[PDB]
Amino acid sequence: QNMRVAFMPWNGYNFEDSILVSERVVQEDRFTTIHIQELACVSRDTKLG
Amino acid sequence: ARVTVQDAVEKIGNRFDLVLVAARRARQMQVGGKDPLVPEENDKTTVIALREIEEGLINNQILDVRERQ
Amino acid sequence: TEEFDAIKIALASPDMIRSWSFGEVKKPETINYRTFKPERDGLFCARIFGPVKDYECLCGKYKRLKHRGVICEKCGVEVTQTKVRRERMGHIELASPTAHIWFLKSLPSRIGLLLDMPLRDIERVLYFESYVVIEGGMTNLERQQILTEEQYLDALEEFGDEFDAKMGAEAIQALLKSMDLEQECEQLREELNETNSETKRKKLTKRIKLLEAFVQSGNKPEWMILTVLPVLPPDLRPLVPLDGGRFATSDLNDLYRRVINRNNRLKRLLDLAAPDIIVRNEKRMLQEAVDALLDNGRRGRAITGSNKRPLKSLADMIKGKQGRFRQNLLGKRVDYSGRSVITVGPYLRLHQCGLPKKMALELFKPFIYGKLELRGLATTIKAAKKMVEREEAVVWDILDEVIREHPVLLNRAPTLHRLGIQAFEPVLIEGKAIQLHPLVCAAYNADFDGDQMAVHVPLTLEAQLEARALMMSTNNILSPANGEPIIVPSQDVVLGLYYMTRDCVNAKGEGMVLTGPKEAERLYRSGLASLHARVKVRITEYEKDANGELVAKTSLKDTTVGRAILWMIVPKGLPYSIVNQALGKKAISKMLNTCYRILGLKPTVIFADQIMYTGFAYAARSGASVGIDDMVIPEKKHEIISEAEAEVAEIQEQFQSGLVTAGERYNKVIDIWAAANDRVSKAMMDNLQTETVINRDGQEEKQVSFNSIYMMADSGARGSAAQIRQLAGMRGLMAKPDGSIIETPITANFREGLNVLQYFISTHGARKGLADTALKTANSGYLTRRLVDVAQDLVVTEDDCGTHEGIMMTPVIEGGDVKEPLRDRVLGRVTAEDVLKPGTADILVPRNTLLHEQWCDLLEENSVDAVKVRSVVSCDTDFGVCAHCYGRDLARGHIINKGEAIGVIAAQSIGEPGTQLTAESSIQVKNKGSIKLSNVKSVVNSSGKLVITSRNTELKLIDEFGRTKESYKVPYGAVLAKGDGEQVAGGETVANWDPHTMPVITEVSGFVRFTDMIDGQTITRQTDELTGLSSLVVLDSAERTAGGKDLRPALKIVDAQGNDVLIPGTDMPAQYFLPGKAIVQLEDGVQISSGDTLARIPTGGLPRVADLFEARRPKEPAILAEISGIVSFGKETKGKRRLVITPVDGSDPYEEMIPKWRQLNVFEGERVERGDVISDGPEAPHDILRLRGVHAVTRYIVNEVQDVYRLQGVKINDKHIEVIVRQMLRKATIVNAGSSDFLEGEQVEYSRVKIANRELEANGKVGATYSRDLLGITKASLATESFISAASFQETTRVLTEAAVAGKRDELRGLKENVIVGRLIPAGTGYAYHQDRMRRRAAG
Amino acid sequence: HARSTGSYSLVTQQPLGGKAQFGGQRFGEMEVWALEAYGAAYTLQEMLTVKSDDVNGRTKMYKNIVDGNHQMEPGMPESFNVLLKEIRSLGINIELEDE
DNA sequence: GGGCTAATGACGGCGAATACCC
């Protein structure tokens, strides 16, 4: 997604390649992804039953 | 937090047996056989023992004399 | 746990193996796969190895703990704790005695030479193709005769008796049992007393040493053949049942099953008395299975079921990276540890780190439980657990309270050097990322682009104290490699400070006078003055000039607002000047340096934190950004490019006509393009650098621009001039795959747009770069591993050994100037002896004193040039080094403390930086000085030249006050101009010689006389007309014609009368053997001038460092002289020309063969010195050490490595290279006799202590002279005393076999052994402990 | 990821490696060297025995920590005993001597 | 499901084992 960036050092919170982000980004819910795990339970036939 | 131990190493210049004497003292302090000679400021017993070492009250010889006494 | 020491290794006898074993595994089955109870007999058996479940038998008759020794009558399983199933070993009774693969296939085949039988024969026997007649009684056949099938048949039929032959490992065991160790040993000593020949004497000495080792150790040779085979406890080779009735098994289960199968089938076949062929096949099959068990991979590589990969055998489990020692015994996996992504956290103190709540709770769980129970919040431990799993406010309060002073260890994945692990005090924070203090990133090489870090918790009290004292960030500000600071501000900080200190011609508040920095800040933050604006301020600096008292000096300085704002932080002791400048990267670094040297640690720490905060803040206030217009295309670029294109066009057209070769045209184009690149770069730098033409009140002025990209360049925050060029200029020349340089460069830049070709080329460049870094990293890692490995055991044990030896250290002045000054080279080294002023009895430094900054400055005030300092290599201490011989240099400033493991610090410091490692016509004096010649003996001739007659001649430069600035090496035959005394102007040509031509120089005058220079036989007169042209060819040994092979043409130098003029002082008849390719152009009849031409004669980085440290013969070594004196020729043309060195005093008989291709640099009648060059090329360190001795080889290695390292601009102190070298030459070879075995390679330590014991005894007794040896770190480590150290990283099989046969005993004595065994290392905090234990033995 | 105590491995009784199963960080040989460069003997010692490999040591240390005392009892790592057993499985007798 | 049986695409270094050259 395309967002408004400003190139400047902001009290070394973007010191190294790190990135600073605005609470509006989480508010607007624009970097929230959906993930999906699969789980499997298998019932086999043992000789005890 | 005690950010530098430079004065404690200036007391004993080896900088290694410093750790041993401070460990013995802090172990006598944790298992409550002894009492601290310095007013604690909510420090744990390690930094207490270092604070005591830097003030000149405790070294190896004081430990030996007090133990035999 | 017992208190033990001395791990002993030896061959296991079959009775001992039976002793360990608890039962026989008869059938290969393990478990019923249906009911998971183990087999009644099998690889997993309860009656042999132990009960599956604690204290209960298999059939279930006895299950209670009341019974602890009973063995159930039905199931023979004893009732005990299942843990024992982890230690009980079993055994298998082999029907056919089997060979141990390790003792056979290991490169020196110890069965082979022990039996004195070549490996080929043993292999012939083992695969069952032929017999061997072992002690065939009274017949006509020897003892090691190989016999073919039908030869054995006809022999057996003819000779029924007195014919003893057998087959296989049982035959070999028979050979071993019947051997008389001592009789053969004594016979061998007699043979050695009778034999004088190199190679046979070496094989004999190896064998005699093997025999002596067996008779001393008490191992009988027959044990190399296995009769009983032990089987590993089951829980160590599990057969775990996967969910779903299927099983997962280690490969050892498969191998054991196969072995048992083949064994049982062979047993049945033996009971059946099957024919020999079949039993032989079965015995072979059992051999493959067993040898696959022991070491799978030395045969047809018995692969696994349906996977095509060779399965892993025991040797594979031990040896190798993935297997063992590396993986599980030096590379464990601790508890109370975590991992997460790293983040900035500027607000932190230097000694702290942001730690997520949830990880901190998880790590400190048991601490939480303890504190919760102490406070009574929880009745029992389970209630504490439940309280932690709900995570109530009380839990967080307890966590905050416990965390208070508890330090944690932070580590970053590639721990290159010891600063890869540091301790911090954690501060609980939200989030899932670990917060790392910015200043320490440089130490960690950490970057916030997804780098992760691990966090460990020290548990015991001694560990806590050690983490906070030794490892804490604030205690490690100086790099252990060189003394300089590690924590220097990196990029944002330095940018902010740079912005703050730079001044501008005109701004708001120009030239107003401020009473101090505080009102400067008043002005700046209120917007009544610019952050940078020239101003007069009154400032009170403090100076500790007295004995530790601070004196305030208060005056008016002309500075910027910004410099005042910065001054607020600076501690008292520092001069104002420090901040007064532009304050870039270097300036800030040296600021920190001075602050440390003057005040000490704590002020430096707090000052660094302050610097970080102010830099970050004001960088943010600056608002520095990067727009497309910030990078200014030079206005005159297009002209430069069009001009260069016109020039290249003219040169190419002028090529098509054919006045210049292709190579010459290439060179011309490349040079013109390079010049154009430099032109555009300089134009761009002029445009960008000082372009702010801003106006003061009236007229204009110009100043260093405020272009953001330029500030980023100049400050040293990011980018170099090269990248600025790459942005705004033409991006220079490129290299094609093979290294050749493309003719047309990339004229475009990233501000503009490249096109397909230029991009493509740069793509190649970047690709090659990346691949380089990958392979470079792998090689680095390997090199640093060897280094830390070899030098681990070295520890500072003694305070002062008291030796007078030392190395005379000078500043390495390579050619033009002083690449590295004295002061840094000597700082922190103790002196070997007092040095005197230029006037005797004027002692400048008492006997050994640590040379700190004050002494170095004092030496600067005087004019000391070279200082002899005690070095670690020459240290006298046994089993370690002494504090004084080492010196001070550390992350701290003081003399080294007893106990410190200097080997590892040296190895790490040399290894970690190793990841950025990849004409001569006229001499030109750089600075006006006096010329001085060293190690020369000249003879002024008639032409008026100071003729150089020495090959080792040097021309140094003494300055006004007696110091050697420049140094050059002047070879034989270089025309000279100025002699001795003359002052030479700047850049004036003092010497001259032909680059691609080495002339042969005559010493005397007269007529050239032809001796053995016969016409027709070896030379062919093809001569031209009057003008004196000829083609007389004196060919070399290789190129001489077929007829003139043995007739050697010569030129004797006679005078005008005829008599051979003799070299002054010597009687030698001058018989000049014309060397190779002697083109006699100037024919007979032209008066020879002094200087006539007789004969025209036409790697670095990581591999170079690894090769220097491994002491690898560079495949074409130069040759040296052993003794001095008249050399001479000998028996001619045998295939390698003989040179016999004849000593004027010493004995003659030293001959050296020389190949035909070798060219000689010295004349026959010349005066050589020992270890002078005879042939040109790279010298192998071994010869230099052997001839010149220890200090020479150590200086050579140190300088050669330091050259590579400084070429990249990485500073390392020489002491580390010295420590490694000292670890390299640990071994010596005995040449005399008296207490040793007269030839054994023995460490110099044991040899020295033997001499010391003789000295300690009142009687002189025997002292034996020894010669030093230098071994490369891989082999040197292989020949270590302790066998666990060597086994830890090398071929495990080889060293294990050597120690097993030798019966070696390990006292552990080292660091790595103690680590492996899990006791206290003998270094540092544990040194006292081990010293204490030393007192505990042999005491009361 | 973080762990205090959890499941340990079968053959060499060290904690599992990984994220799926709790798993501890790998204190590798380079880290060992880092600690050796300092005089840090007790930290390395606990890291080598009490933190991973010594079974009796780890349980005694858990109990000791719970008791509010911070001492230790290093013992010999189980992996070393496994090593002895594996080398002994060859024809090599390797014994821990005593005097 | 259960029961029974069991090929080719690294490279360098080094030291020992023949090949051969006088």
Next chain:
RNA sequence: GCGGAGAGGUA
């Protein structure tokens, strides 16, 4: 459900 291969990715 401890392991080991193969594939990919991170620094």
Next chain:
DNA sequence: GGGTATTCGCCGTGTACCTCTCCTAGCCC
């Protein structure tokens, strides 16, 4: 026969971490 080359074969080739599939097999009763 003894010293020198040459083939030959073994041994090594960075750390830390994160995903997924796949795991004794074939034939006969």
